[PDB]
TrEMBL record, chain B:
Organism the protein comes from: Enhygromyxa salina
Protein name: Arachidonate 15-lipoxygenase
Bias type Basic and acidic residues, positions: 10-24
Domain of life of the organism encoding this protein: Bacteria
Region (Disordered), start-end ranges: 1-24
C-alpha cells in the first residue's frame, strides 16, 4: 500500500468512515485538568508483550531488593515472598516467550504499586512497615546499603565533587537549564572575590562576562509555583536557587562559581562560594533538590509526556490510517497513552511516589508542570533554536556539553529523515493546505492552551512547517525523552546525590549531613521507582515495527521500506560512531543520545 | 528532673529524637481555613476523666 493525502485518495468515503470509528475509540478525558487526556487505555495502545516482559524483569529486581532490605531490618515471610517473586521472573522469561495472565495482570499491577507508593509491594497474589527500612539514618551507609539487589549508581561516590555538580548542567537530567549572561542579574550580585575563589586570580568576573564564559541556571519557577509540604509531620523544604557557572579562559569544562538559595537577597538568604566547605556542600545539595522537582515535572513529565499527549490524541483522531503523516508519527507514540495513564492515576496522583518524596504539595507540583506547558513555544522550541536562544552555542567557549553536541546530531538526522518523508508525499505546497485532515489536525492543536491546545503550535501551512512539527515530535518521542528519562536510574537513584525534598532547613548548615537526607522508607522508594523508570530500553529509534505479536516492519510503501528509512538508519549508525567516539574521551558519560539506546517513543 | 535549655542539655541526641516523635503525633490540618490547626485530638491530649465527669453532670441537666 502507498499512504496518500485525503484529497488525492481514490476512496474518500471509506477513509472518513475509519476516522469516525477512530474518534470513537480515542475519546477525550480529564485525567488531569487543562490538558487533553484519553479515556483509559484504548486497546490498540495496550502495552506490547515485549514491553511487559522487559518491565516485568525490572519490577522483579526492584521487588527482590525490597525483600532483601526487609531481611536486613529485623536482623520465613521474607523467604516465602522471595520465591514467589523468583517464580514470576522464571514465568516471565519462559511462559511469555510463547508469543496473557502472567504477562498482563502481574506486570501492570507491580508497576502500579511501585509508582503508586502502595504498601507491601513485597509479593503479588499472596494477600510505614516497621519490618522494612524506615525512619532516620544511623549513618550515611544506610543509603548506599539500600541498593542490595539493584546496582548502586556511580554518582553515589562522585557527587560531592564540584566537577560532578556542574556536569549535571551539561550532561544530567536537566541539561537544558544554563543560559549565557552578559551582566549579572540584580538579585544575584556575586563578587569578583567569589569568582577568584573558584577560577583563581588569573581570571576576573568582568573578563568572563565579556567573553561569554558565564552561564546561569535560575530556578525562579520553583518559587513561583510550589508550596512546601510535610511528611508524617516532618518539614520538607525546597528552594528557588540561582547558581553561577563559568568556563576557564580559552574554553573548557563548566565549573561552579556561586549559589544563592533564594530569589530574594536577605539576611537569612546569602551567597555561598566554592571555599565555604560544609555550607557550600549544602547550597549545592539545595540546588540538586530544586532540580529534582524541576526535572521530574518540567523537564521530564511536563515537556515530554504531557507535551505530546494532545498530539497523540489529535493524530489518531484527525489523520486516517491511509495518511502518510499518520504512518510517520504513530510508531513514535507506542505506549505513550499507556504510560501517561499509569503516570496520571498512580505516579502524580495523591498518595503516589511524587506526593511523598518531592517537597511540594502534590497539587502545587501540577501547577509547576502546567506552568511550563503554558509558557512553552512549540514553533520556537527546536533544539538548534533553543541552543542559540540560551547562548550555549559556541563549541569553543563551552566545550563539554554532551547533550548539545550529541543531541544536535540526532536532531540533524531526524530532520533529514523527516524532510525526505515529507517531500516525497507532499509534492506541492498546495498539497499541505488542501490536506483537510492535516488542517483539522492543526486546528485542535492550534487551540488555546486552556481549551486543550499546545502553546505556540500554529500554523502548519508550509511543507517546512510540517517538517519542523514532525521533527520536534519525533525528537521529543525519542532523543529528548532518552536525555531525561534514563538519567533517573543512573543519576537520580541515590538520595544524597539528588532528591525531591530537603529535610533540614537550608544551605546554612546546622549539623550532620545525614539529617538533610530523606527518611529511609522514602529513600528506598525513590531508588526503586526511579530505577524502574530509567531501566527500560524498549523499541529503538529508526526501527519502525508493529506493537503486535509478529513485530513485523510497519511501513508498506517500498519507497520508504527500501530507500528512505534505510537512509535514516545509516545516518543514525554514523552519528552513533561519532558519539561513541566522543564518549570514551569523556569522564562523565552520556549514553542517552546514542542512536542504539534511544527508543522510538515515550513508553516508560 | 530539672528542666534544661537545649544547648545546655546533657543528653542532646535523645532530646532531638523526642521532638521528631512529637512532630509525628501533632500534625497540622486545615480544619479552619487560614489558621494553624491540629489534626484531630491526639491521644495524650484526650480529655481527662475528671473533665468528662464534671461536664457530664452539666450536659445531663440541659437534656
Amino acid at each position: 500500500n502507498i499512504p496518500t493525502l485525503p484529497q488525492n485518495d481514490p476512496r474518500p468515503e471509506q477513509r472518513a468512515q475509519q476516522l469516525d470509528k477512530a474518534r470513537e475509540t480515542y475519546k477525550y478525558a480529564d485525567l488531569l485538568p487543562p490538558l487533553a487526556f484519553c479515556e483509559g487505555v484504548p486497546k490498540p495502545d495496550t502495552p506490547s508483550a515485549a514491553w511487559l516482559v522487559t518491565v516485568g524483569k525490572v519490577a522483579a529486581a526492584v521487588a527482590l531488593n525490597a525483600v532483601a532490605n526487609r531481611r536486613a531490618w529485623k536482623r520465613f515471610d521474607v523467604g516465602g515472598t522471595s520465591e514467589e517473586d523468583q517464580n514470576e521472573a522464571g514465568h516471565n522469561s519462559f511462559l511469555a516467550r510463547l508469543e496473557e495472565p502472567s504477562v498482563l495482570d502481574e506486570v501492570n499491577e507491580r508497576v502500579a504499586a511501585i509508582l503508586g507508593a502502595k504498601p507491601n509491594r513485597h509479593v503479588p497474589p499472596a494477600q510505614v512497615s516497621k519490618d522494612g527500612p524506615n525512619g532516620r539514618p544511623q549513618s550515611m551507609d544506610d543509603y548506599a546499603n539500600l541498593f542490595r539487589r539493584i546496582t548502586l549508581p556511580p554518582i553515589a561516590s562522585t557527587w560531592k565533587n564540584d566537577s560532578a555538580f556542574a556536569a549535571y548542567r551539561v550532561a544530567g537530567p536537566n541539561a537544558s537549564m544554563i543560559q549565557r549572561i552578559t551582566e549579572l542579574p540584580d538579585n544575584f550580585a556575586v563578587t569578583d572575590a567569589h569568582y577568584k575563589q573558584a577560577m583563581g586570580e588569573g581570571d576576573s568576573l568582568d573578563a568572563a562576562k565579556a567573553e561569554g564564559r558565564l552561564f546561569l541556571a535560575d530556578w525562579k519557577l520553583i518559587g513561583e509555583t510550589l508550596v512546601n509540604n510535610t511528611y508524617k509531620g516532618a518539614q520538607k523544604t525546597v528552594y528557588a536557587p540561582l547558581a553561577l557557572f563559568a568556563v576557564p579562559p580559552g574554553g573548557g569544562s563548566l565549573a561552579p562559581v556561586a549559589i544563592q538559595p533564594g530569589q530574594t537577597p536577605s539576611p537569612t538568604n546569602k551567597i555561598y562560594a566554592t571555599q565555604d566547605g560544609n555550607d557550600w556542600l549544602a547550597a549545592k545539595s539545595a540546588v540538586q533538590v530544586a532540580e529534582g522537582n524541576y526535572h521530574e515535572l518540567v523537564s521530564h513529565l511536563g515537556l515530554t509526556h504531557l507535551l505530546l499527549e494532545p498530539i497523540v490524541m489529535a493524530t489518531y483522531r484527525q489523520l486516517a490510517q491511509h495518511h502518510p503523516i499518520y504512518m510517520l508519527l504513530i510508531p513514535h507514540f507506542e505506549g505513550t497513552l499507556s504510560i501517561n495513564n499509569s503516570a496520571a492515576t498512580n505516579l502524580i496522583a495523591p498518595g503516589g511516589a511524587v506526593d511523598l518524596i518531592f517537597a511540594g504539595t502534590i497539587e502545587s507540583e501540577h501547577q509547576l508542570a502546567l506552568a511550563a506547558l503554558k509558557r512553552h513555544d512549540f514553533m520556537r522550541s527546536g533544539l538548534p533554536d533553543t541552543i542559540e536562544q540560551r547562548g550555549v552555542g559556541d563549541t569553543s567557549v563551552l566545550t563539554d556539553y554532551p547533550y548539545r553536541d550529541d543531541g544536535l546530531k540526532i536532531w540533524a538526522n531526524i530532520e533529514r529523515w523527516v524532510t525526505a518523508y515529507v517531500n516525497n508525499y507532499y509534492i506541492s505546497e498546495a498539497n499541505v493546505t488542501q490536506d483537510t485532515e492535516l488542517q483539522a489536525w492543526a486546528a485542535v492543536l492550534s487551540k488555546p492552551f486552556a481549551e486543550g491546545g499546545v502553546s505556540g503550535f500554529g500554523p502548519i501551512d508550509t511543507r517546512a512547517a510540517l517538517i519542523f512539527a514532525c521533527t520536534k515530535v519525533i525528537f521529543t518521542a525519542s532523543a529528548e525523552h532518552s536525555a531525561v528519562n534514563f538519567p533517573q536510574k543512573d543519576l537520580m537513584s541515590y538520595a544524597p546525590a539528588i532528591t525531591g525534598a530537603g529535610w533540614t532547613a537550608a544551605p546554612p548548615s546546622q549539623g550532620p549531613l545525614k539529617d538533610f537526607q530523606p527518611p529511609l522508607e522514602l529513600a528506598e522508594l525513590q531508588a526503586e521507582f526511579l530505577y524502574l523508570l530509567g531501566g527500560v530500553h524498549h523499541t529503538k529509534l529508526g526501527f519502525y515495527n508493529s506493537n503486535s505479536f509478529p513485530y513485523r516492519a510497519w511501513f508498506k510503501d517500498p519507497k520508504i521500506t527500501a530507500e528512505l528509512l534505510p537512509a535514516f538508519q545509516r545516518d543514525l549508525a554514523a552519528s552513533e560512531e561519532l558519539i561513541v567516539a566522543a564518549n570514551a574521551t569523556r569522564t562523565f558519560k552520556y549514553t542517552y543520545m546514542i542512536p542504539s539506546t534511544i527508543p522510538m517513543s515515550i513508553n516508560i
